[PDB]
From a paper:
SCD results from a single-point mutation in hemoglobin (Hb), where βGlu6 of normal Hb (HbA) is changed to βVal6 in sickle Hb (HbS). Under hypoxic conditions or in areas of low partial pressure of oxygen (O2), HbS becomes deoxygenated (DeoxyHbS) and polymerizes into long and rigid fibers, causing sickling of red blood cells (RBCs). While the primary interaction between HbS that initiates the hypoxia-induced polymerization process and the subsequent fiber formation occurs between the pathologic βVal6 residue and a hydrophobic pocket on an adjacent HbS tetramer, the stability of the fiber requires additional secondary interactions between the HbS molecules. Aromatic aldehydes, as exemplified by vanillin and 5-HMF, form Schiff-base interactions with the α-subunit N-terminal αVal1 amines in the Hb α-cleft that not only destabilize the T-state, but also stabilize the R-state to increase O2-affinity of Hb (pO2 at 50% oxygenated Hb, represented as P50).
To ascertain whether VZHE-039 binds as predicted, we determined its crystal structure in complex with liganded Hb in the R2 conformation. As expected and similar to previous aromatic aldehydes (e.g., INN-312, TD-7, and SAJ-310), two molecules of VZHE-039 bound in a symmetry-related fashion at the α-cleft of the Hb tetramer with the aldehyde moieties forming Schiff-base interactions with the two αVal1 N-terminal amines. The benzaldehyde ring made both intra- and inter-hydrophobic interactions with α2Ser131 and α1Thr134. The Schiff-base interaction directed the methoxyPy group toward the αF-helix residue to make moderate intrasubunit hydrophobic interactions (3.5–4.5 Å) with the helix. The pyridine rings also showed extensive 3.7–4.0 Å π-π interactions with each other. Consistent with our design prediction, VZHE-039 made novel and strong hydrogen-bond interaction with the αF-helix using the methylhydroxy moiety. In the VZHE-039 structure, the methylhydroxy forms a strong hydrogen bond interaction (2.9 Å) with the backbone nitrogen atom of αMet76 of the αF-helix. In another structural difference, the benzaldehyde hydroxyl moiety of VZHE-039 (which is absent in TD-7) is engaged in a strong hydrogen-bond interaction with αVal1 nitrogen. Most likely, this interaction may have led to the differences in the positioning of the pyridine methylhydroxy moiety in the two structures, which in VZHE-039 allows close interaction between the methylhydroxy and the αF-helix. Comparable to Hb Stanleyville, VZHE-039′s unique interactions with the αF-helix likely perturbs its orientation and moves important stabilizing contacts, including αAsn78 out of register, resulting in direct Hb polymer destabilization.
Author numbering:
A (entry chain A), B (entry chain C): 1 to 141
C (entry chain D), D (entry chain B): 1 to 146
Amino acid sequence: VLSPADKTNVKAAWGKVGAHAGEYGAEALERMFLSFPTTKTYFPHFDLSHGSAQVKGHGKKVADALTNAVAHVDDMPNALSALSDLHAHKLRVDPVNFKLLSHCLLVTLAAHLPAEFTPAVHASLDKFLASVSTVLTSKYR
Amino acid sequence: VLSPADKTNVKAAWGKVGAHAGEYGAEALERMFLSFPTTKTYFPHFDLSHGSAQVKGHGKKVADALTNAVAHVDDMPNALSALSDLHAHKLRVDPVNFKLLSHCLLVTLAAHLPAEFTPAVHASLDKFLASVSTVLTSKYR
Amino acid sequence: VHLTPEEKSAVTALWGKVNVDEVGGEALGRLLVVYPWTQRFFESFGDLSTPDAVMGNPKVKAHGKKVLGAFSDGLAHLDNLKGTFATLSELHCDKLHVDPENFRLLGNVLVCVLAHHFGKEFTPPVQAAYQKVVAGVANALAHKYH
Amino acid sequence: VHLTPEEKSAVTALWGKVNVDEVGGEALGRLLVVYPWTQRFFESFGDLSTPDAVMGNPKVKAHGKKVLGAFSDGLAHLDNLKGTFATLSELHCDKLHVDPENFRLLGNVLVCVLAHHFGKEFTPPVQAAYQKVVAGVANALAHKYH
Ligand code: HEM
Ligand code: HEM
Ligand code: HEM
Ligand code: HEM
Ligand SMILES: Cc1c(O)cccc1OCc1cccc(CO)n1
Ligand SMILES: Cc1c(O)cccc1OCc1cccc(CO)n1
């Protein structure tokens, strides 16, 4: 459950990303794939080599979803019902993998936005990604 | 996130608990304290002896809060604001301990309600207790 | 190694009354239903679309027996769980890459199944003794991660 | 843990640039803020009521420096993390009864701080090497649980 401050922190921090959405998303994916090799087993049909156009384009998809989640932070289950059916019903992703990606997203933001990544904002961002993760791993339809 | 069926299962099962609320709540607590003695450190000034009146009193408090949560399953954060201001703000309970109590609650339900504890209702109750745990462990004020 | 003499006695006494042909299937089945992402590891097991399909799936019950047999092997060697589950640890960790947390979840699902069957007989001291069992099994199974 | 020669070089190079007066304190600090339940272990550390209070707390900065020094010892003895952290494991497990999950959280928090401090120099391969190290350290501390 996010506080009003959490929501403010998340919007401000993610608003700084802006045009770097695809880059940061792709970087976060590469970080997850390299740091935690077992996450690659969910992408067997993917080109997962470094510099992959496939990973690059998919990073953009993940970033845009996050941006949409920020926009509907008060209405996540309905707004993310689409991605939930994919990740929970079809893909059946282990929730631990969402923790890994969330961590790699935090690392990416810390690396690119040091002024934004304060302890409080760090906390809010972590809760936000944890929230998105819970929705995408829950079968609620 | 709970499905309509999840909400249906929880209400039907916890409704069957009825007046056995204070009993099951106390038993669940006693199962926690005994199976996981580290949880007792959260109750340093409690009489945690077997069958103590304080524990049975606390069990009824837990059970009634759960009954309240069931009635407000669509609006947990608001209904549980006070319980989230003394579990998350002052007692700062480690979320692992909520998994322990939630488990002991399921064990207690399974021990007393064999016909009600179907695999489907099992799964729904777990999600419900996880939701309550998430809300009580989060700082949204 | 842990488990007190009294805990070993309580675990042994109850386990002799356990249906080795059903409890395993019930445990694995409920694991797949309560934590649906676990179904991904059993894709060749057929129909896992609904709870009724899972619990009635012949392969799930069959594999459950194997799982329960391993728990039985653990209870006969309570002071050497890590050697008992050595081979299984390599399978689940190095080959299957099952996250350790799932080991703990199955152990606690088993605990619920035991409570569901024995009811009032599954007393808090009995549960407490079995909590150390399933934790020792989960740890031994994740040994190759350590 | 198992690092390639190229990974060991990159880890050592980055670690030699680490501000040993602040990085540890910021790591322990962010832990206490992002995961507030961890504050329970540090009651005697005075004011932890606000994020600013936690980061600026002299006892937090001091203790965080000891944490960082533990990681330094880990890096200098990667071939024997279990023996290196035997004393600390007995402390964090048998005495403090810290949950092993919290060990992983702190390790990952440190990674975030390193990324925060070094920016683009903390590349994904560099992170990958440090994830191996923190996993090994966290596993070494929970060794008395095994
Ligand atoms: C944590 C936040 C996450 C977000 C916001 C997210 C978002 C997305 C989006 C937007 C898509 C494309 C949906 C479409 O086709 O329109 C997708 C697909 C996918 N995601 Fe995620 N995801 C997340 C976590 C994860 C994790 C942790 C994993 C696995 C470790 C994962 C595995 C996959 C896979 C396998 C696909 C399908 C790729 C394909 O074949 O096109 N997701 N995700
Ligand atoms: C479903 C989960 C839980 C529910 C519904 C719940 C509910 C409650 C309720 C109703 C109270 C009494 C509030 C009052 O007196 O005004 C309470 C107090 C308390 N709870 Fe929980 N609780 C849960 C989980 C936990 C867990 C897992 C722990 C620790 C391991 C915990 C530790 C405490 C403590 C230390 C108090 C204060 C008692 C006192 O100092 O008198 N709670 N909780
Ligand atoms: C925690 C206690 C567990 C025990 C005692 C256990 C026991 C076993 C045993 C005895 C086998 C048979 C191995 C063989 O005959 O070669 C097996 C296989 C297997 N286990 Fe487990 N297991 C446990 C947990 C888990 C969990 C939590 C998962 C997944 C989330 C899992 C996934 C698998 C899979 C996918 C196989 C092979 C299935 C196949 O042949 O298609 N295990 N396990
Ligand atoms: C995961 C890696 C960790 C490392 C490398 C580490 C390192 C250390 C070190 C070097 C000490 C000093 C011991 C001494 O001087 O005798 C210490 C003490 C301590 N640690 Fe940890 N620690 C870790 C995790 C944790 C976590 C996650 C917690 C709590 C959530 C924790 C709680 C404590 C406490 C309460 C003390 C003693 C404080 C006091 O003396 O007042 N540790 N740790
Ligand atoms: C609020 C919260 C946390 O602090 C951590 C994990 C999940 C979580 O909530 C997830 C959730 C479920 C249903 C609806 C919403 C708000 O859209 N969030
Ligand atoms: C929906 C859900 C899960 O399947 C597991 C854990 C938490 C969770 O949501 C918790 C939550 C947060 C905010 C509002 C509500 C519904 O009142 N639930």
